[PDB]
Write a protein that binds this ligand. Structure first.
Ligand SMILES: Nc1ncnc2c1ncn2[C@@H]1O[C@H](COP(=O)(O)OP(=O)(O)O)[C@@H](O)[C@H]1O
Lengths: 590, 48, 277
């Protein structure tokens, strides 16, 4: 009978709707759910049904590939006509599990099937017309989310999925689609999450829109069947090798922005902000952020903006903003109407998008204080609090910030402190971990080096198995200016961020506390800036980031020394000239 | 390679054919006394 | 993980129903409140602080001795069989290891017989493992990335179920008992097992028991337990196998490659089928 299902004289959906074929594959589905073999694992689905009936779970989960092995055409019919096939798979799963767990219908009326690990993946820009009425798997970001309400009852919810922040082509707004979520699949995600969902792609706005206007139009939606929120050993064979190489930290820093000369105290600050620290949440107490905050203040030139353009491409999820081009609404949240539930719905801004990512604010000084106040509370609380249009809620905004600014009058006053060179108020300055102060002072020593670098940078980036040949040539040029190929570094950073969570050793407690007390003693001795605990909190974070560079699970003494160097150097360099020279001699050891 | 885009008859049979090809070739190789190759040798693509 | 407590289940008529229920649903179970556990803790302390392994013993073709591993890690292993035909003269050089081995083998032997009695339906194989007919392997790591291994013995015993992965186990007061592939094939398909994962730098001590190695696995061929143990040891120690068993190492390494292509071809049929439709 299984072979007879292959022989089809009609369309794919037409053949399935036949009662004999429907009952044929219903028996075929029923046979598989208990009969399977995975060598040592044997009938894994027998245990799957066992634990599912143990939990009385409504979510009937299945792996896609396993069905295609025992029942070759049964799985392919499921893919081409998911609605028709899952309709009877509801009953087959009910009867097959009732073989193991009878009287299941006594409590639960239906068994909605959750498909998993579907292999074919589509992006929001690849949804061709041929993909209509078919099972599809897409990945995106949760921008808009509705509440939970019953539907003609069972739970219902509606969500929008938006393109990946770092993949939008220039000149286009981010493409997005409406997604339909059913019962038992509600509250699976929250705004700002990056998720992959499997569902059916179809048009469903027929009815009232037809007679509403001439040349009527509809919209495309995705009926969420199952949603999900990944490495291989062959790649880890490369990451582990480089992780223990000599000068791994120096290879990373020297590979930040290859075509930018000098500014090594920024490049090390960019490198640390990419890897980040380790967030902590003590139960019954407050949490601790792990994101590294960088402030780039300097005279016109010095490529502060080009750094933020390099961070945009290298980081995983980068959201770029500008002080004047942004608004208070455009950062925190916005409000949309929804006729399905009739309550107001909230859509997140730029800070919500960059959750578990980096938020870039170019020309940070030029925005108004009301716009700047939102950014301050964003870095402090890592969340957005809003009370607008009757909606009171909080969203996750765990993002790292890299800011470029300009001093008052367009030139840095070397004889005055940083707290008196910019309009940025001191409480907002305290939210930064690394404060880089770039001066542009003339000298033939630096100018010949810088110019000969730039004049070679332009002659390098000059425009003019062929794909492999071009990639090899680009790799050659990457090696000529950087120690590490860039796309490898992108993968290298992602693995370190995802896998490595380096931990402290209490053996280094003396190394940390003694330096802090020594730094505190000099603060009252010389200078007006008092050393705060937040500096020590900054030292540990960057110390963890340095350990995360080596892919070592424990903090070493070497990482702490470089961690102490960066924070002390920034604190010293921000002081006025008279105080600056005194502190450099007092901290020659560090 | 089948004359139709999809056929379950040529799915299990070719999967069994691969099993038969692999298992029989497994028995052929183990008869050798020299150092048996630890990995399947790579096919060489003929010029089109 | 199932737990067996001697304060609650200690009789044969109590253990046998429990072991059968465990083996038909699990491949690893815990032993709790064993009287010798307190003595084992003191013995393990000596083995980790004073009883440094004898590195001059070397490692032989019989898969016995102190094998050095990567990162200067040392693995002390001994194999013994009651059958005189096998020359396992390289017995354990440390008394503390023998003290643990005797205590583990005193009760583990009864448990191993229970495991066979639980799932092996053959009446002839009920007494295949005994005091005068047994084979045991003692393994001890030492240090001055987890290793995946699949024991072939009927029962694998650890004096402490800590830092062992398969999910991790962190029970300091419970012993770990694991069953290998030999029990699975004699169970007529009723029981199967899964490999374990351990940290080679954790200094884990382990003991595994087989029936006499000369016992044939089945009457349908010449396969014996010694061949099955040799298969596992060659797979576990390819570098040592190259010096003494090159052809067998090549054959066994070929099996893994032949398994990969079968698994790979299984998936590839689905992918091309989906694009066709
Ligand atoms: N330190 C530097 N090394 C090399 N090139 C630089 C440097 N600083 C600036 N440039 C050049 O100047 C441009 C950056 O200018 P810009 O982004 O406007 O700086 P800012 O925005 O900080 O004033 C880049 O195209 C770069 O080629």
């Amino acid at each position: 009978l299984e072979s007879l299902s292959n022989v089809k004289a009609n369309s794919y959906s037409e053949w399935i709707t036949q009662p004999n074929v429907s009952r044929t594959i219903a028996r075929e589905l029923k046979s598989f759910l208990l009969e399977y073999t995975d060598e040592t694992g044997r009938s894994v689905y027998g245990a799957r049904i066992r634990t599912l009936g143990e939990m009385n779970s409504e979510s009937l989960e299945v792996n896609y590939r396993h069905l295609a092995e025992s029942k070759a055409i049964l799985a392919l019919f499921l893919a081409k006509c998911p609605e028709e096939m899952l309709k009877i798979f509801d009953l087959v799963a009910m009867e097959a599990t009732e073989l193991h767990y009878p009287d299941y219908a006594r409590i639960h009326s239906e068994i909605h099937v959750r498909i998993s690990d579907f292999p074919t993946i589509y992006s929001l820009r690849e949804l061709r017309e041929s993909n209509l009425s078919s099972l599809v798997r897409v990945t995106g970001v949760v921008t808009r989310r509705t509440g939970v309400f019953p539907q003609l009852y069972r739970n219902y919810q509606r969500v929008t999925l938006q393109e990946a922040p770092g993949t939008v082509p220039p000149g286009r707004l981010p493409r997005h689609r409406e997604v339909i979520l059913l019962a038992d699949l509600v509250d699976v995600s929250k705004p700002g999450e990056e998720v992959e969902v499997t569902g059916i792609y179809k048009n469903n706005y027929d009815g009232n829109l037809n007679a509403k206007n001439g040349f009527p139009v509809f919209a495309t939606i995705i009926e969420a069947n199952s949603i999900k929120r990944s490495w291989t050993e062959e790649e880890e064979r490369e990451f582990r090798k480089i992780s223990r190489d000599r000068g791994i930290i120096d290879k990373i820093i020297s590979s930040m922005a290859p075509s930018i000369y000098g500014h090594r105290d920024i490049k090390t600050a960019v490198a640390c902000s990419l890897f980040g620290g380790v967030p902590k949440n003590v139960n019954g107490k407050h949490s601790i952020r792990g994101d590294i905050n960088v402030l780039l203040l300097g005279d016109p030139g010095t490529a502060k903006s080009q750094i933020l353009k390099y961070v945009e491409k290298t980081a995983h999820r980068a959201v770029f903003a500008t002080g004047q081009g942004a608004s208070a609404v455009g950062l925190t949240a916005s409000v949309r109407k929804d006729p399905i539930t009739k309550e107001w719905t909230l859509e997140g801004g730029a800070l919500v998008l960059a959750d578990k990512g980096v938020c870039l604010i170019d020309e940070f000084d030029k925005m108004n204080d009301q716009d700047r106040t939102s950014i301050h509370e964003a870095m402090e609380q890592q969340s957005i609090s809003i009370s607008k249009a009757g909606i009171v809620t909080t969203l996750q905004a765990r993002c790292s910030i890299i800011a470029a600014a300009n001093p008052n009058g367009g030139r840095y006053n070397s004889t005055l402190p940083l707290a008196q060179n910019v309009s940025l108020t001191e409480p907002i300055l305290s939210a930064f971990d690394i404060l880089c102060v770039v001066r542009d002072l003339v000298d033939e020593e630096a100018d010949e080096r810088l110019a000969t670098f730039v004049v070679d940078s332009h002659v390098r980036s000059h425009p003019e198995n062929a794909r492999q040949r071009r990639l090899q040539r680009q790799r050659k040029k990457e090696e000529e200016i950087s120690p590490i190929p860039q796309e490898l570094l992108m993968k290298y950073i992602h693995y370190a961020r995802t896998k490595i969570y380096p931990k402290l050793h209490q053996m280094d407690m003396d190394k940390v506390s003694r330096v802090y007390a020594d730094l505190r003693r000099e603060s009252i001795s010389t200078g007006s800036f008092p050393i705060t605990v937040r500096h020590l909190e900054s030292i540990l974070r960057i110390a963890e980031s340095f350990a995360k560079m080596r892919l070592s699970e424990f903090v070493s003494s070497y990482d702490l020394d470089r961690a102490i160097k960066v924070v002390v150097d920034s604190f010293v360099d921000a002081q006025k000239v008279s105080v600056r020279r005194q502190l450099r001699r007092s901290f020659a050891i560090y | 390679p089948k004359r139709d885009n999809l056929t379950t008859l040529t799915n299990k049979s070719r999967t069994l054919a691969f099993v038969e090809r692999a298992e029989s070739w497994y028995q052929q190789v183990i008869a050798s006394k020299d150092e048996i190759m630890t990995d399947v040798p790579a096919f060489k693509i003929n010029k089109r | 993980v199932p737990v067996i407590d001697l304060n609650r289940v200690s009789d044969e008529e109590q253990l046998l129903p429990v072991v059968r229920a465990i083996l038909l649903q699990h491949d690893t179970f815990l032993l709790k409140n064993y009287a010798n556990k307190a003595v084992l803790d003191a013995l393990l302390a000596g083995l980790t602080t004073k009883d440094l392994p004898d590195t001059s013993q070397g490692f032989d073709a019989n898969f016995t001795g102190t094998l050095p591993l990567e990162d200067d890690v040392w693995l002390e292993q001994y194999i013994f069989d009651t059958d005189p035909q096998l020359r396992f003269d390289r017995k354990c050089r440390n008394e503390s290891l023998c003290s643990i081995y005797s205590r583990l083998f005193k009760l583990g032997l009864f448990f191993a017989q229970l495991c066979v009695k639980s799932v092996v339906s053959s009446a002839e194989l009920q007494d295949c493992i005994s005091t005068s007919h047994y084979a045991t392997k003692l393994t001890r790591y030492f240090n001055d990335d987890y290793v995946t291994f699949l024991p072939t013995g009927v029962l694998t015993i650890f004096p402490c179920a800590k830092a062992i992965r398969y999910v991790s186990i962190d029970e300091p007061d419970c012993l770990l008992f694991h069953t290998g592939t030999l029990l699975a094939r004699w169970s007529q398909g009723m029981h199967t097992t899964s490999p374990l994962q351990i940290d080679p730098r954790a200094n884990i001590v382990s003991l595994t028991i087989w029936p006499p190695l000369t016992t044939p696995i089945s009457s349908k061929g010449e396969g014996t337990i010694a061949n099955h143990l040799l298969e596992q040891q060659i797979k576990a120690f390819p570098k040592v196998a190259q010096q003494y068993y090159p052809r067998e190492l090549s054959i066994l390494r070929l099996q893994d490659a032949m398994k990969f292509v079968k698994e790979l071809f299984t998936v590839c049929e689905t992918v091309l089928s989906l694009n066709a439709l």
